Amino acid sequence: SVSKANVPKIDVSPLFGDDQAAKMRVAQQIDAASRDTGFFYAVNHGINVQRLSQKTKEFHMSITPEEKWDLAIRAYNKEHQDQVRAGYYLSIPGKKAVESFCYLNPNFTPDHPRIQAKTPTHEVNVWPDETKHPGFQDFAEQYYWDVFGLSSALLKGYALALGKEENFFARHFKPDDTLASVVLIRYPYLDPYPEAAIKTAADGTKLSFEWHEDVSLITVLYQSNVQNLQVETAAGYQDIEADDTGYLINCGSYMAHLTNNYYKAPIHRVKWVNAERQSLPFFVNLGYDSVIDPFDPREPNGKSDREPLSYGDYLQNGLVSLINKNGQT
Template sequence: MSATQTETATESWVHYHDGGKPGRRRVLTGRAAQETFSEVPKIDFRRIYSENLEDRRELAKEVGAACRNVGFFYAVNHGVDEEMLKDTFGALEKYFRLPTDVKMETHNQKTAKFRGYEAFLEGKLDPSTRGDLKEGFLMGEDATDPEQNRPVTPSTAKPRNQWPTHPAALFWRPAIYRYYNAMYTFSKRMLHIFALALDLPETHFDSITTNPMTNIRAVHYPPQERQSDVGIGAHTDFCWFTLVCQSKTAYPALEVLNGNGIWIPVHPQPNTFVVNIADFLKLVTGGTWQSTVHRVRNFGGEERYSMPFFFSPNEDAKVSVVQHLRKEGEMYDEFVVGEYFQKRLDIDRRTHLDDGNGVGEKRNGGY
């Protein structure tokens, strides 16, 4: 029985966080099982670069079906430079091998946005575990970083990111920004495909993503030995969508939860990104699209590295359910993206750092 599953004499349930709130799903087997997905679909993304609108619309149809039925899909043949991706994974391995004191220079507890280094077991999405068995580094939108070429305003004038200054770690910032820029460009194209999948003009969301909220979380998952451990607990993401590039391992560590409460493995695939819909797009579609629960459990005996890129609308953007998906007579709330993001950050992220009195709880950030 995993850390996120409970059983009674007649029933078994999977527990998770969905939209920042605890949830659970009954495990259904045999005659009780419902029609749901048993694998993550693969979609050829070469058409995203086509100048023919009909090609992009055909791609959007496949993407829309995956968003409605699964909430996850593989973006195959994404077109992002493979050598750059290989170099970035090399930088991840090099960074996480650095001495702890070098990494702790940018400990995420030093910033309001929890940017920087997160040590092992500091995140704790599943309260039944001793913590998430991973270490990571979080960066994101920051107008004071010249690499992002963003306008500096009173609300964005304070630095958000932290970067190491030790000579042994100076390779890290340029390596991450090469990845950041490539994923940012691809995400802008992806947003057009999502708009077409919703029967909207492909530029529909452009006005609210002029300065989008973005994050990269570089993550290292060591091999797990305890069955009670989890790399990261079961949850949904709180952004527009997530692109994941994961290292090649023989044993799949990323798992997504289907409608029957069964964990479906997401195998590493060459020349692919794993794409998942997150809470903002679920909200904007009135629940038509799935923000699917997922987790990481690394039991293959290998070191695993992952680089999720999170893309959201502008921090001050106001969003609600798109007009043609609204039901007659129902009221729909409008929410400010940055406020919702911070609320989810506060709910989902906890650390149990030693506060001098044993175990203490603090809020945390990241993936």
Template sequence: MAATAPMIPSNIADNSSVKTLAESSTLSSVPSHFAIANDSRASHCDSIPIIDFSLLVSDNPDHRAKGLRDLDNACREWGFFVLVNHGISESLLKDIVDVSLEYFELPEEDKRRYEANTVADPITSGTGSVITMANQKINLWRDFVTSYVHPKFHCPPKPHRLREVLVEYSEKTRSVVRKLLQAIGENLELEKGYIDEALKLNSCYQLYAAHYYPPCPQPDQAMGIPTHTDHGLLTLVVHNGVAGLQIQHNGEWFNTNSPQNSFLVNTADHLEIFSNGRYKSVTHRAVVNNEASRISVVMANGSAPDAIVGPAEPLVERDGRAYYRPLKFLEYVENKRSYQHLGKTILDSMKIQDDD
């Protein structure tokens, strides 16, 4: 008879955070409702693109041309890059990681206030789960908190300094993303201002998400976040120096590394749709380890919630057809969040097949 995974230790409540569970002195293996075998092997790669943001905003035409070429190649070939020299202070990056960690150290009752009920909830918190192809619910080995921060700002009241840090962080990252998108529009040979108007970027969607991955006694028997792509245009990630983000490139998995004071950036579903397939939404996952806690802070950036996002008309004319269906941004987000089954993707359903 096959051995069954253990249950939660008797001194831990069923709805406790993963952090509390991981810190239990009696925990020696993954409890049954977290247990799923996975292969997190990945290679190291020295050729993951590094984009120097200062070149993109340089007055030197040669420097800027190089920055644009590098960005175009990164979005076309990888859907992922490391962003350096972006102008956001190292102290602010440290603050957003530190204050996010403070959230996970709050008492359980404070965090339970935001247990997710619907995708429309402006603030959510919990552990999260996925449904396997065998229709089995599996909890993820992480705690999270999310908050919509633009066009309307929301924030948990605790920890008290989170609001102040998050307001500044969302503003600074939004500015960086806007400039990246303007450069992308230029690379796509769109008229100046086209991308801003078509996607209504003055009212752009921005979501803050912090993920806490405590050490796991059996990393090959639990998931941080399974294989997925992101909704939106560009996602920016910073972390506490503990690796865990893996990306898929040409069918192979790679570990990502980032120097201090840099962002990990991936292109997302709506950039693939808007570019009519020129840029690909990168597949990625978060893995866990048995040695150190990892915290990552994600800022997801999209069009305005009410914007209809489809392939840019000039690109459709150039290509002779649209390769993706248009859909209101917020409807896409809501539909994507309902895709909890492993192995299914809403992005595939948006592609127009030759025989459609």
């Protein structure tokens, strides 16, 4: 009644090295995965995900309602009009099970020119008290750059897969202006589980989050070992097996745009599971002014009749639309 999707596990370690042929074989595997279901697992990535899960758990389980209010985004706290992206996404006992904490580029400070110019989507991160959550901010900022490094290498594999020089994407993925974000999501075990937090799909499947396309260039996701994701194919939704040692990768609607849908943004949804688990996405976003000219790999000339799309305008409209369709997280 429900089959399983083919999600290959790609050894991405050659993307850090100098062997050019080895990197082409990795690119071929990305091309194959990106043309099939759209998902693949990155293995041999060199990020310590045990420390990731541990520190994220200690933070989620030790934060108090008082601290949540102080870190809340404007959707939950009228006083924080400047917190549209970064801050805490409170759960609602009896109505909403999920909660999360989002933070952005640690370089976004009051001295940063984008912050001074008050450019949309740019915000300064808010953190809990170092005394109540010792070492959390240091760990979170370090992880941001660890996963930034992995993302930079993956984008070289995507560039080689499409026939471009390995810096075709990475040249727009810079530490000093990237709009990428880290989200630390908790899916709690609840007994009883509130029926108001469970959505019923058209095919009857119980969901925690409805179908969607990612607002990103690529999505780099770590999850605990609890099956939950489903990818849409022509023959219905397929389960994505879980793996808590690797990173699940998939393209966003910005990749689909600039490749004229050669690399589709796979539609996927989150099944409902009453289990304590973690979902830790890192959304690979470019700079607010970053523009990549669209092209079509299918065409010998690569000519495409698609308008170039500023990543700032794409992200701004994309985040809003995702809230109107699937709701406030």
